[PDB]
Amino acid sequence: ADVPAGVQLADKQTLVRNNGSEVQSLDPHKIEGVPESNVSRDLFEGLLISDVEGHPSPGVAEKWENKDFKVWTFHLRENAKWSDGTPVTAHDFVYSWQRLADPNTASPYASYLQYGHIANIDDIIAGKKPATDLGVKALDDHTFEVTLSEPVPYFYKLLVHPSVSPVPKSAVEKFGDKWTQPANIVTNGAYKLKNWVVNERIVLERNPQYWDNAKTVINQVTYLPISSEVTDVNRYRSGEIDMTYNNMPIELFQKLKKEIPNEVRVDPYLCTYYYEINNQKAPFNDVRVRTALKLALDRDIIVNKVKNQGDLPAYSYTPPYTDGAKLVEPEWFKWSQQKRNEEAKKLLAEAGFTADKPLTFDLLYNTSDLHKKLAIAVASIWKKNLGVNVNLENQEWKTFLDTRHQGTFDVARAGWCADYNEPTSFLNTMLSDSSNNTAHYKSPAFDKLIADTLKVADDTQRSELYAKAEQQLDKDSAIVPVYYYVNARLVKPWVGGYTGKDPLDNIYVKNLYIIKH
d(CA 165, CA 46): 4
Strand partners, 67: 71
Q: What share of the chain is helix, strand, coil (3-state, %, to 5)?
A: 35, 20, 45
**Which has the closest alpha carbon to 504: 111, 110, 158, 72?**
158
d(CA 252, CA 366): 20
User: What is the experimental resolution, given in Å to one decimal place?
Assistant: 2.2
The CATH number that domain 271-486 falls under is: 3.10.105.10
| DSSP 3-state of 425 | helix
d(CA 307, CA 27): 35
Options 3.30.565.10, 3.40.190.10, 1.20.1260.10, 3.40.50.300; CATH for 1-44+169-270+487-517 is 3.40.190.10
d(CA 312, CA 86): 48
Domains of the chain, residue spans: 1-44+169-270+487-517, 45-168, 271-486
| DSSP 3-state of 12 | coil
Q: How far is CA 180 from the centre of its chain?
A: 21
Q: Do 303 and 462 touch, CB atoms closer than 8 A? A: no
Q: Do 327 and 338 touch, CB atoms closer than 8 A? A: no
- Report the greatest alpha carbon distance in the chain: 72
- The pair phi, psi for residue 490, each rounded to 5°, is -105, 135
On the question of a cis peptide bond just before residue 283, with omega within 30 degrees of 0, the verdict is: yes
Amino acid (1-letter code) at residue 321:
Y
d(CA 310, CA 322): 17
Amino acid (1-letter code) at residue 334:
K
Query: How many CB atoms neighbour CB 475 within 10 A?
Result: 15
Q: Do 118 and 134 touch, CB atoms closer than 8 A? A: yes
DSSP annotation of 213 reads G
| DSSP 3-state of 106 | coil
d(CA 431, CA 447): 6
Name the experimental technique.
Answer: X-ray
Q: Is 500 left (phi over 0), alpha (psi -120 to 50) or beta?
A: left
d(CA 112, CA 105): 14
Strand partners, 488: 266
d(CA 110, CA 350): 40
- The pair phi, psi for residue 192, each rounded to 5°, is -130, 155
Query: How many CB atoms neighbour CB 217 within 10 A?
Result: 21
For the 45-168 domain, the top CATH level (class) is alpha beta
DSSP 149-209: SS--TTGGGGGGSGGGS---HHHHHHHGGGTTSTTT----SSEEEEEEETTTEEEEEE-TT
Long-range Cβ contact pairs of 59-64 (< 8 A, separation 24 or more): 59/159, 59/160, 60/88, 60/93, 60/166, 60/188, 61/144, 64/156
**Which has the closest alpha carbon to 421: 159, 189, 246?**
159
d(CA 494, CA 484): 29
Q: Please give the torsion angle defined by the CA atoms of residues 460, 502, 24 and 29, in that order, rounded to the nearest 10 degrees.
A: 60
**Which ranges of 307-427 would DSSP assign to H, the alpha helix?**
331-334, 337-351, 369-386, 397-406, 424-427
What sign does the dihedral 364-468-115-165 (CA atoms) show? negative
Strand partners, 145: 73, 137
| DSSP 3-state of 306 | helix
Strands laid side by side in the 479-490 sheet: 312-313, 479-490, 264-277, 411-417, 360-366, 389-395
- The pair phi, psi for residue 168, each rounded to 5°, is -90, 100
CA-to-CA dists, residue 1 to 212, 243, 510, angstroms: 10, 17, 6
d(CA 8, CA 140): 44
d(CA 345, CA 339): 10
User: Residues 318, 320, 323, CA angle at the centre, nearest 5°?
Assistant: 90
Length of the chain, please? 517
Helices 369-386 & 287-296 angle (0-180, nearest 10): 110
The distance in angstroms from the start CA to the end CA of the chain is 19
**Which ranges of 55-146 would DSSP assign to H, the alpha helix?**
90-101, 112-116, 121-125
Q: How far is CA 286 from the centre of its chain?
A: 28
**Which residues, 6+ apart, have CB-to-CB distance to 72 below 8 Å?**
64, 65, 66, 145, 146, 147, 148, 155, 156
Q: How far is CA 39 from the centre of its chain?
A: 13
CA-to-CA dists, residue 431 to 84, 219, 349, angstroms: 40, 42, 31
| DSSP 3-state of 434 | coil
d(CA 325, CA 505): 19
CA-to-CA dists, residue 363 to 177, 377, 462, 500, angstroms: 32, 12, 35, 33
Burial of 391 (0-12, 13-18, 19+ CB in 10 A): exposed
Q: Please give the torsion angle defined by the CA atoms of residues 481, 445, 451 and 506, in that order, rounded to the nearest 10 degrees.
A: 10
d(CA 385, CA 482): 16
Q: Do 217 and 9 touch, CB atoms closer than 8 A? A: yes
**Which has the closest alpha carbon to 504: 24, 191, 37?**
37
Query: How many CB atoms neighbour CB 184 within 10 A?
Result: 15
Q: How far is CA 485 from the centre of its chain?
A: 12
CA-to-CA dists, residue 210 to 60, 188, 416, angstroms: 10, 6, 31
d(CA 512, CA 517): 15
